[PDB]
Design a protein around this ligand. Structure first.
Ligand SMILES: C[C@H](CCC(=O)NCCC[N+](C)(C)C[C@H](O)CS(=O)(=O)O)[C@H]1CC[C@H]2[C@@H]3[C@H](O)C[C@@H]4C[C@H](O)CC[C@]4(C)[C@H]3C[C@H](O)[C@]12C
Ligand SMILES: C[C@H](CCC(=O)NCCC[N+](C)(C)C[C@H](O)CS(=O)(=O)O)[C@H]1CC[C@H]2[C@@H]3[C@H](O)C[C@@H]4C[C@H](O)CC[C@]4(C)[C@H]3C[C@H](O)[C@]12C
Ligand code: 118
Ligand code: 118
Lengths: 268, 268
């Protein structure tokens, strides 16, 4: 059976048979030496059937070489079983994500906020946890802390890139009784004089959305994020953070400012 | 903020930012013409955030380059949703097949048969449907059926490759007095003579198993295939075909016989 007839028997292209010969997966029975023409037999169709049966299960080519040459190799198929289970979980989450994205673009003509699930590493921060009467009053008392901590810790260099955020330790919603904890990441340990202390903040996977503009609309992102958090079945494992990209330090106009709200979540 | 500090903000590789810049997506703010350095600003971070959100959604890069600026293009999102649904369906299929594979390999030392789905086209066959008392009498009676057909039709040329097969239109296991229909696909129309007719057999999606051995033990294969259709949640849509590829006519050794069982099947 010449390669054309055989390629139509097994119903696959010629280049596929060329490739399977090139990698040594399916070798013709008899190659004519001067022309190089490949001729197969029935016992090449018998092997191509096994090859295609394994290849419909997603096995990579080298995995098929091993599956056909090494017997009692059930650990590689089980490994592939676990990987396929992981991709099914991931694809179902993707389904929920794309349903929510389509649900939004029909709900609003503009996508104001996209939600990204990113991993944030562990940090070394100086932290002050305290009650706040008003979030507007919360903004002013931070540069005093900036003076104070650099005073008490000489030569303490903050991490680059700068990570300056807020934990919201409140389990429900209110506007004037916010129990917050301001954390900012530095390089080394330090002195703990004052309400300012040092602590290690563990690495977390968190869904974050970046809101750009003034802070009075920031709650929007939270409602959105909360929707997201409930829609895709994620569970909020820790208190929500808010990391400051743009603000009074870089830029003077308060409408081009930008913060990023981060929800610590776990997949359940 | 050079590309290193920006790549450390997003926790992304320098090569990814390079690739994005090459493709036109996420062009940086300032490319210094003396040394070609790349400086990024936080607005580029805001753009990269939605880039990373879509890349976390499964969207290919050309789809992100078309989605990040032409904000009206929405049909491409239900289209991606349909692609993901197709993949989830096929992955669930694959998962059922891998679990069935694992149970069967843990069962027996030797994997005798290996099922594979393939799309068999429609084909113009000549057919003869009739009753047989046993399998051996049937095996002996096919060749005179072929001889009668080649005599009654002058100029009848078979199709290459030779798709010559039979159908068991019974639904339960009938060992004797079988209602069997032999058929073979030909090049073009002939004239109906006797009880042999011509017709066009429609294209199917068939789960196939190649039996190597004498014909009286093809039965095993069917049971296996049956388990495969009940286990992996497929459904037998039509009478099972059995195609003869290699056998007593081409090689007189009984142990080099090849028959390709084809269950017409549909997904549930
Ligand atoms: C969902 C979350 C708990 C989990 C609740 C409990 C505390 C709530 C925040 C605070 O109230 C401060 C602030 C008030 C503004 O009005 C809206 C934004 C802020 C950040 C709130 C967002 C959100 O509502 C929080 C995080
Ligand atoms: C699995 C399948 C459908 C089961 C529902 C049953 C129903 C009809 C059965 C065939 C016929 O009996 C003819 C023949 C008898 C031999 O003895 C063994 C082989 C044959 C081909 C059988 C195989 C198998 O057993 C069949 C396909
Ligand atoms: C110590 C404590 C706070 C700040 Sb900053 C800041 C943070 C990261 C990168 C640049 C600046 C600040 C504010 C105004 C003027 C100058 C610096 C800051 C304040 C509130 C909330 C978040 C960050 C700086 C040092
Ligand atoms: C019409 C009917 C049967 C056969 Sb064949 C056969 C040939 C090629 C591929 C598959 C089957 C046959 C028999 C003798 C000499 C040459 C060809 C055949 C034989 C036994 C059982 C079933 C079919 C051929 C034409």
């Amino acid at each position: 059976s010449q390669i054309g007839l055989f390629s139509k028997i097994c119903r696959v292209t010629i280049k596929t048979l060329h490739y399977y010969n090139k990698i040594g997966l399916l070798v013709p029975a008899y190659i004519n030496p001067d022309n190089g023409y490949r001729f197969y037999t029935s016992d090449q169709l018998m092997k191509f059937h096994q090859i295609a049966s394994l290849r419909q299960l997603g096995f990579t080519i080298t995995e098929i070489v091993t599956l056909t040459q090494d017997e009692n190799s059930c650990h590689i198929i089980e490994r592939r079983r676990l990987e396929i289970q992981k991709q099914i979980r991931d694809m179902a989450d993707m389904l929920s994500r794309i349903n929510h994205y389509l649900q939004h673009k029909k709900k609003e003509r503009i996508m104001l906020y996209q939600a990204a699930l990113k991993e944030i590493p562990e940090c070394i921060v100086y932290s002050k946890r305290f009650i706040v009467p008003d979030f507007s009053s919360y903004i002013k008392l931070i540069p005093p802390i900036g003076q104070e901590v650099m005073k008490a810790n000489p030569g303490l260099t903050l991490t680059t890139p700068a990570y300056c955020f807020t934990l919201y330790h409140d389990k429900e919603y209110k506007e004037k009784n916010m129990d917050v904890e301001f954390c900012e990441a530095v390089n080394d340990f330090g002195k703990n004089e004052g309400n300012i202390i040092f602590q290690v903040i563990p690495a977390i996977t968190a869904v974050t959305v970046i809101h750009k503009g003034p802070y009075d609309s920031l709650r929007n992102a939270y409602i959105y994020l909360m929707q997201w958090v409930e829609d895709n079945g994620y569970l909020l494992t820790n208190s929500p953070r808010e990391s400051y990209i743009d603000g009074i330090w870089n830029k003077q106009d308060s409408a081009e400012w930008m913060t990023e709200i981060q929800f610590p979540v776990e997949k359940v």
